[PDB]
Ligand binder design. Sequence first.
Ligand SMILES: [Fe+3]
Ligand SMILES: [Fe+3]
Lengths: 381, 381
Amino acid sequence: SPIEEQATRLLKEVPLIDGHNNFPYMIRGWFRNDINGQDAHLYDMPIGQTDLQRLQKGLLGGQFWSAFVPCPKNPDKEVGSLEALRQTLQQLDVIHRLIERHPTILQFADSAASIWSSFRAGRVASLIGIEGLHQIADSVSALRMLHRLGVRYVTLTHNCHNAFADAATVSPELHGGLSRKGERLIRELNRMGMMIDLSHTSHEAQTQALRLSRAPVIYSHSSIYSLRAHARNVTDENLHLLHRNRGVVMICFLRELLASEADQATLAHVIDHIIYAGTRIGYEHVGIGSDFDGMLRGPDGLHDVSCYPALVAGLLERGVSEEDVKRVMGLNVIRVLEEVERVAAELQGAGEECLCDELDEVWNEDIKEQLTRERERVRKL
Amino acid sequence: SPIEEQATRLLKEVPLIDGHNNFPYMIRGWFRNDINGQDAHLYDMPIGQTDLQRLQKGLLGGQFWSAFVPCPKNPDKEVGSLEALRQTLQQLDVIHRLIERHPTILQFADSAASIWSSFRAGRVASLIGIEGLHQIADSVSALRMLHRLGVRYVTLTHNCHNAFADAATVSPELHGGLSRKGERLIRELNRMGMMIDLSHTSHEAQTQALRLSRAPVIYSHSSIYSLRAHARNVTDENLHLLHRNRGVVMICFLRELLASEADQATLAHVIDHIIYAGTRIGYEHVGIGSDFDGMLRGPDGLHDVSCYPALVAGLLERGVSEEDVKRVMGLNVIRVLEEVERVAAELQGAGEECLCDELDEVWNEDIKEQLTRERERVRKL
Ligand SMILES: [Fe+3]
Ligand SMILES: [Fe+3]
C-alpha cells in the first residue's frame, strides 16, 4: 500500500518515541529481574506486549521505560516508603542491565541529543521514568540521585496520595491538588532538569502543576476526557493549560480510558483522541504514550509493540499531515525534553538554590564546641 | 630547602591520591548538607581538618571522598537497614553537589584515566567510596546503582557486622570472617568493577577476602599491626596475602592506630608504618589513607589536609627513592583501580552471570495463566 510505505518512510526519518512502557515490571513479574541466560525469551516473550523482536518489528524509534514500583501496602508507612526506594533501585538496575546486555537493539539515552544519536545508530533510544513520588521515600537527595541514574521524568503520583500531590483514582483528596512541599518540589524538578509527568495525578493537581511549572510537562500516558470521561483522562481546561505550559499529552492505549466498554476499544479510538487534541491545542502538543504492559489486552489493531506502523498509517489516512504525524510520533516529546534541559541549564547558570532534605542533628553542642576549639588550635600553629 | 622543593616537584609530577577523607560527613554534621550560600565557609571551615583552601595548599592530587553513614541503631533492623540506604543517597548527593559547585577545585573521577585528566587540568580528582555493606540494605541491585552513581570502592564493613562480613571492633564474631553471601558478593564486586576495601573488617575476613578476590583490593585507611597492635591494623600474614593479591595498604593518620598513647602520635610514626610495609612487601603495595575528618585531632605534623608536602618530604628524608615516593603518593592506588577495571572488563567480556537479589513473587499462578493465554491469542492473529 502507498500509505504503508509512507508510514515506513516516516518511521525511518524521525523516531517514534513512546511515552510509557511497563516492560521492566513484566521482567520483575516473570523473571524476578534475573535475565541471565534468558536472551531467547527476551526476544520472544511467553507473556506480555513487549519483547525485543516485536520492538524491532514495529520500527519504534525510542522508549521511556517505566521504573514503576507499586504504592506501599505496609501498615508501617516508614518501612513501606523506604521499601519502595529499594525496589526503585531494583527496577532501575534491571532496566540498565537489559540495555547493557542488548546493545544492538537498545541504547541508553537521557537527552534530546542522545535520542537522535541512538536513532541514527539504528537503536531504540532507551529512556527512563519513575511512576510516583512514593518511589523517592520523601528524599529530594534520592530524587537527584535517580536523575543521575538516568531517570528523566517523574510521574508525580501513581494510584496513591503522597506527600507532594493527589492521585486521580483515590478519594477523598489529601492536599486538594498539590501540597506545599509539592509546590516547592516543582521548582526543584525544573531546576534539576527532571521532566514532570502528570498522568495518574488528580485534575486539580494537574491544574496547579501546569500553572506553576517553569518548564513544559508531559502526560506520559493519558487520554481525552471529552471523548471518554475518566479520572485518568485530561479535561479541556487542563489541555488549555497544557498548551500554555508548552507541554505534550501522550495518548494512551488503555481500553478503559478509550471507551465505556473496554472490549470495544480500537486503533480508531486512539486516532480520534490524537486528532481531538491536535485539532484543539495543535499537533505540536500531542504524542504517543501506549502504556503497553500496563494492561492484559490492547485495543483492536494495537495489541502489542509491533503495531506502531498501523498507528502512523492510520493518522495519515485520516488527513493528518506528514509534518504533524512526525510531531506526534516523537519530535514533540524531544522538544519538551530539550526545553526541560534548557530551563535547567538557565536556572543552574543563574545559581538557583537547590531544595535540601530536612535532616536531624548528628552532633550535640558539646561535640560542636570541641570541633571549634580544635579548629582554633590549628589556626594558632 | 632542597628536600621541600623536591617534594613540591613530585606533587606536581604525579597526583598524591588520598584513600579516605570523611569531609562529606562533616558537611552533614555542620551544614546538614545545605551548602547554599556557604562558599566562604567551605573554603575556610570553622570546624574540621578539610576545606577547599587547605586542600589547594597541601597540593593533594586526588581524593576518595567517603560517603559513610553510621551503622543502623534502630531496634527494627528492617527500618534501620533501609534508612542507611536513604542516608547513603543523601551523602552521595552532597558529594556530587560539592564537586558540581566548585569545578575550579574539584573534578569528579571514576577511573585511572579520569584521575589523570583531572590532575592535568589542575583539579583534585574526586572519587567516592562507601564505608560498610550495611549501606546497600541487602540489595546487590542498589550496589550496582551506587556504582553508576560513581562509587568506586566499598568498605565491606564499618563497626558493625553485616550479612556479608565481620567488622574488626565488634565481638563476638557473626560469620567468622565472610558469610556465604559475602563470598558470593566478592565475585560480583570483581565482575562489576567495584574496588574492595578491607579497612574496618576483621583479620579473618581480610584473609578470606584476600584469597578469594580476582582483583587487587585496598585498605583505604589502615596501619601496621606489628608496629601497633590494634583490631584495625593489618597483620604480617594479611600484608603477605595483600602482596599476593597485588593490593595496596593505604597508611592511616589515626593516632590510636599509630601509637599506644594517642597524644604521642606524629608524622614520623606515619612514615615508620609506610617504610615497614614498603620494606617488607614492596613500595608498589603501600599508599596514603589519612582518614582526615574521621578524628578530632591529627598527629603532630599531620593536623590537616595542608600537611601533605611534609609527608612527601619526610619520606624522601628517610631515604625512600623518588620513584617509590611517587608510587606511595598515588601511582599504586591508580594501578589497583586500573586492574579492577581490567578484571571487570574481562569478566563482562566473557559474559559472567551477575548476582541478582532474591525477590518475592508479585503474580499468583492465575495471573501468569491469563498472561500466557493472552500471548497465544496475539500469536494466532
Ligand atoms: Fe501508569
Ligand atoms: Fe573509617
